[PDB]
Design a protein around this ligand. Structure first.
Ligand SMILES: O=C(O)c1cc(C(=O)O)c2c(n1)C(=O)C(=O)c1cc(C(=O)O)[nH]c1-2
Ligand SMILES: [Ca+2]
Ligand SMILES: [Pr+3]
Length: 562
């Protein structure tokens, strides 16, 4: 019972959230102001729900809420439907995964989409699955790509104009990134768009594939040889949608392999934001945040539409906080660069950006080719591969006009080595050691003014930040930490105003809605993601955190709101 019109209405209906992002554009702003800075001290848990199964590791989903039911996912490709008032399980679906799934960076899933009477998610073996919302039974299932080649799906899918859209993951395995659209009611494929230059895109009619143009025009323009056959650029975080331009906004992963000396050229459309026509999957514009990447600076980070006035004229902009340390503001009608500036305190790989937004490179920060030796010499670089910001989404507060960015301060030693492609095997050609830049913190929650280009406030955390952000009309910003807290801040000043220890690192993006006249806040807990794969000093810092897997629901009691 979710229509396309209801999706387009988020977040205006207080009782429900039917989108990843609290609105198709991904602003993660709630207009609810029952809960505010003056009464958040009265927020407390009302129930929890354990995912069970002796299956923990990272838990990244944002729940959706419709008709008093919460729909969410867990690690190892599981879906849960849970009563929003009581916490009682309605049903659970556990995908049967093969033993040879190939995630790069933990067995995570970032959420469902809803349409009609169905619940949709992508699996770690690169299937797209539709479940009946009331029973959890499978209605249809389609293979998006071959998991034996290194494809997986970790992102939440999205609905645009009645079409169900998913990307894929796997750049660390040399997959060919692609975005594809499906009929939500029966899983019929509608179109497919590669994100690597040289591959053909298609529309589908009557079960036939109809050519619909080569991505990037022709193979070999910004890649050498046949490197584009394994080029990566996986659109692994999903994307968002702008109704004003009718464009899907999707970022793309790093080019493969990590050894950039094997692939001279800009390597399109890796490490880029793409704007696509949802009718047919054609790319209307692109902006490449890291041409010829050498640092696994994936360009997937969300591109969030927002509007502002400049010298009397209305600007249709979009902002993104990139892995590479720059915060970018683009004209979302045509992809043109407006401004770009660091949102972390140290960037070594570039000294700035040119007038089109292309980096001005510092070539001493690119690791050298191995040449005669087994490994090249290491170079120190900031940010580290894990980025100034990774998967975890920022949020936009319409009242303050600021973005709230979960960032990290770390560099690395990185080196290169030879690497041959082998189907199903890692395709790196580089190694690294992460080196935090500061002894007493890594994570920094930052409030950024995208019009002036200035940081307004910052809040430091000992561990890295790895969780999505929520902001609300009550002058609140919420986000989780690996220490296990859900925390709230004053959106104007950054002062901490509330927190709760959930018992496991919090990665899920928080969500808020209203039921029976009371405001609820919920988040998914359970530590994991890429940070536990880092050795060295980062591992020492996070060693005492424990795994989990739990949905937490909090409420402000009606009698305490005033
Ligand atoms: O290039 C890719 O296809 C791809 C996929 C993913 C993924 O699917 O989650 C990550 C990465 N790259 C990546 O580079 C990275 O640092 C990363 C961290 C995480 C995580 O959930 O903590 N996922 C991924
Ligand atoms: Ca369309
Ligand atoms: Pr990557």
């Amino acid at each position: 019972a979710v229509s396309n019109e209801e999706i387009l209405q988020d977040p205006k209906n207080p009782q429900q959230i039917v989108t990843n992002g609290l609105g198709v554009q991904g602003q993660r702003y709630s207009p609810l102001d029952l809960l505010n800075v003056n009464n958040v001290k009265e927020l407390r848990p009302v129930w929890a729900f354990s995912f069970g199964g002796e299956k923990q590791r990272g838990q990244q989903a944002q729940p959706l809420i419709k008709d008093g039911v919460m729909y969410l996912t867990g690690s190892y490709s599981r879906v849960f439907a849970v009563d929003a008032r009581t916490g009682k399980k309605l049903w659970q679906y556990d995908a049967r995964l093969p033993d040879d799934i190939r995630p790069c960076c933990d067995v995570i899933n970032r959420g469902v989409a809803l349409y009609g009477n169905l619940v949709f998610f992508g699996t770690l073996d690169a299937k797209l699955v539709a479940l009946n919302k009331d029973t959890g039974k499978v209605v249809w299932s389609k293979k998006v790509a071959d998991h034996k080649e290194g494809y997986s799906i970790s992102a939440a899918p999205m609905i645009v104009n009645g079409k169900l859209i998913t990307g894929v993951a796997g750049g660390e395995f040399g997959v060919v990134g692609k975005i594809q659209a499906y009929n939500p009611e029966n899983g019929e494929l509608l179109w497919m768009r590669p994100t690597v230059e040289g591959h053909m895109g298609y529309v589908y009619k009557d079960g036939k594939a109809i050519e619909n143009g080569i991505s990037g025009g022709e193979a070999g323009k910004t890649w050498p040889g046949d490197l584009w056959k394994t080029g990566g650029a996986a659109p692994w975080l999903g994307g968002y949608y702008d109704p004003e331009t009718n464009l899907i906004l999707f970022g793309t992963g790093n080019p493969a392999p990590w050894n950039s000396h094997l692939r001279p050229g800009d390597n399109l459309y890796s490490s880029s934001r793409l704007a696509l026509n949802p009718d047919d999957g054609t790319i209307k514009w692109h902006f490449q945040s890291t041409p010829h990447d050498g640092w696994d600076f994936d360009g997937v980070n969300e591109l969030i539409s927002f509007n502002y006035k400049d010298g009397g004229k209305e600007v249709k902009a979009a902002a993104t906080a990139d892995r590479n340390g720059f915060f970018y503001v683009l004209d979302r009608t045509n992809g043109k660069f407006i401004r770009g500036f660091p949102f972390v305190d140290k960037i070594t790989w570039a000294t700035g950006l040119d007038k089109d937004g292309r980096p001005i490179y510092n070539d001493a920060s690119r690791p050298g080719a191995p040449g005669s030796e087994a490994k090249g010499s290491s170079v120190f670089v900031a940010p580290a591969v894990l980025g100034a910001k990774n998967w975890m989404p920022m949020a936009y507060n319409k009242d303050t006009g600021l973005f709230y960015v979960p960032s990290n301060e770390w560099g690395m030693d990185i080196w290169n080595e030879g690497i041959a492609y082998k189907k199903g095997a890692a395709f790196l050609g580089a190694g690294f050691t992460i080196k935090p830049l500061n002894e007493d913190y890594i994570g920094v929650l930052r409030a950024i003014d995208p019009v002036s280009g200035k940081e307004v406030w910052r809040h430091k955390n000992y561990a890295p930040l790895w969780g999505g952000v929520l902001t609300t009309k009550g002058n609140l910003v919420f986000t989780g930490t690996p220490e296990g807290f859900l925390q709230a801040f004053n959106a104007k000043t950054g002062d901490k105003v509330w927190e709760f220890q959930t018992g496991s690192g919090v990665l899920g993006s928080p969500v808020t809605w209203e039921m029976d006249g009371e405001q609820y806040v919920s988040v998914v807990s359970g530590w994991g993601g890429a940070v536990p794969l880092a050795g060295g000093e980062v591992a020492k810092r996070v060693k005492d955190f424990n795994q989990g897997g739990m949905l937490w629901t909090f409420k402000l009691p009606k009698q305490l709101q005033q």
